[PDB]
């Protein structure tokens, strides 16, 4: 009715609502999405993201890993923070201390993790006193911490009671990785002291996250003497030291062969833990601003889910007519035409942003079929049998 | 204004559902691959 | 032969000061990251500059690319190939397969 | 008390892996468990307001 | 003499990400090529309809 100048706004609006506010949120956004990508973490070229060449190479590529190096993965956390780390229960360690990539992680558990028998003498009859190296016996003994009675006794618990069963449910329980949307990091939690335990409930999706990617059974390394005889007559040089070429050759072959099962095996299982530890990344906490007395904190889960739910109902926004910063539709009851499609721009942009990342889950579910496809076909390999 | 607000907030949740898939593919994968593991028999 | 190239040296029983064993992380620094998944589905554009070089011998990769190359023929199982017909029972069946007609 | 080194750890092991094969079992079962509960949960009855 | 370089995955990257942020973009007020939001920010509607 523009016949009352009365009914009109004053003053009028055409910009949005608040720039800034987008603004802020929209930076988040960039920096929680490119730090939750899971990269090779073990030298600075090896996370850049981008080549030198193109423009803001650095911008990109610092943000690399940016989730597990604020979070410091790489040294191992003393637990009264409730940080994620490479726990020195399951991990191997780099000395004959930890890679800061915990894909890279597994995967190297799974290629380092040698047989008992190294700790064994050589004819499998005793125990060295003292053993350095970590054997899967014993990282996963680590992982029982105390083995539990049968029946419950009034000092400890039977395996099956729910007393014994108390932090295990929640380390076991597969949503503790995916209903939050930022893992908490502050070790609020102290769970029962045998073994592997999580602090916070950001250990508890770590705990569970290796649980499934099956880590706590490292597959079987080569027996010391076993291996070690089939060395002597393979990596000889042939017809010399009382040495010759055929089995030399052939050994050489069955072990070669045994390794080449076991990295296309970690390779195959770096697949899994990369995508297992992608869903777990998009949901840690990242350090917005560079300094610390004005860090923000804010992870690609919560983000995005900020993303979506600040057009609808927001915590912060007023519910109560005459305050500012009012819902988002009232907001649109009372706005001006340029200044609402000024919101459509801006909000389907955030469409195709969105449907970006969605993007890269479906490049992930190839990623993850197209694996399965072949560890299945390798299991059928053509033999050359006629009779 | 108003329907392509819901346009984000759905094709938001299937993403959620997206990733769902993606979690269930993962863990079939591991289990498949661990009834396959290597052996270090030396017959 | 194809996978002893594969190979390059084997790597030996204890860490020694001449060679690192296997499980050693010596030995596996350069293997580790051409066997991590995020090599071929992190980066957003390949850098293909020859600067790293991990194994004198083996499948080595001097370039994120080829990291990413190394990866993709690891994960295709392609290290191990299928066996194919011995010669003698191939060329005796195929000697029969091929027999002239009543010759 | 009658025991010695080797057996004790052997059989130490043989336990462990056991559980170690249960929990990763309940793991991978957890996991279907929690989408077939999140699907029916979409599906389930909720109060809003806050009075009842 | 114009050879420059990028990948699929890279190119569609920037193509999704520029005008949210963008890294060529001055984050200073005054400067040109400013953050899309803030170039929306003093667009005319016949602009803006264009963007659409």
Same mark, same amino acid.
């Given at each position: ?234 990596? %000889? ?15 050489? %072959? ?11 095996? %970690? ?15 998009? =949901? ?25 739910? =600040? =057009? ?16 988002? &539709? ?13 919101? &459509? ?18 490049? =992930? ?23």
């Amino acid at each position: 009715d523009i016949t009352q100048s009365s009914k009109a706004p004053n003053p009028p609006y055409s910009q949005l609502f608040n720039s800034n506010v987008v603004q802020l949120v929209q930076n988040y956004a960039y920096n929680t999405f490119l730090g939750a990508i899971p990269v090779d973490a073990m030298s600075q070229s090896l996370m850049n993201f981008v080549t030198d060449k193109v423009q803001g190479n650095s911008l990109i590529n610092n943000l690399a890993n940016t989730t597990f190096k604020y979070q410091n993965f790489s040294a191992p956390s003393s637990g009264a923070d409730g940080k994620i780390t490479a726990n020195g229960l399951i991990d191997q360690s780099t000395a004959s201390t930890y890679l800061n990539d915990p894909v890279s992680q597994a995967v190297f558990n799974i290629l380092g993790t040698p047989d008992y028998s190294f700790c064994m003498d050589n004819e499998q009859k005793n125990w060295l006193p003292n053993c350095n190296l970590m054997y899967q016996n014993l990282v996963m003994q680590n992982v029982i911490g105390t083995l539990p009675p049968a029946q419950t006794s009034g000092s400890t618990p039977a395996f099956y009671s729910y007393k014994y069963n108390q932090p295990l449910i929640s380390q076991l329980n597969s949503n503790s990785l995916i209903a939050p949307l930022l893992m908490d990091t502050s070790a609020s939690q102290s769970g029962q002291d045998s073994g592997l335990t999580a602090k916070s409930q950001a250990q508890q999706a770590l705990n569970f996250i290796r649980y499934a990617s099956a880590q706590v059974t490292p597959p079987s390394l080569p027996k010391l003497s076993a291996y070690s005889e089939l060395w002597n007559q393979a990596t %000889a040089k042939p017809n010399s030291a009382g040495y010759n070429e055929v089995q030399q050759k052939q050994a050489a %072959a069955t072990l070669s062969s045994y390794f080449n099962n076991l990295r296309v095996y %970690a390779a195959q299982t770096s697949v899994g833990v990369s995508n297992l530890y992608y869903i777990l990344s998009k =949901r840690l906490p990242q350090n917005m601003s560079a300094d610390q007395s004005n860090a923000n904190i804010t992870s690609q889960a919560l983000n995005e889910f900020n993303m979506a739910t =600040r =057009r609808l109902f927001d915590p912060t926004a007023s519910n109560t007519p005459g305050q500012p910063n009012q819902q988002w &539709i009232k907001q649109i009851n009372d706005a001006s035409p340029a200044t609402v499609q000024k919101e &459509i721009a801006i909000l389907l942009a955030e469409i195709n942003y969105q449907m970006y990342l969605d993007r890269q889950i479906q490049e =992930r579910i190839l990623l993850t079929n197209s694996i399965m496809l072949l560890q299945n076909l390798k299991a059928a390999q053509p033999t050359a049998d006629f009779s």
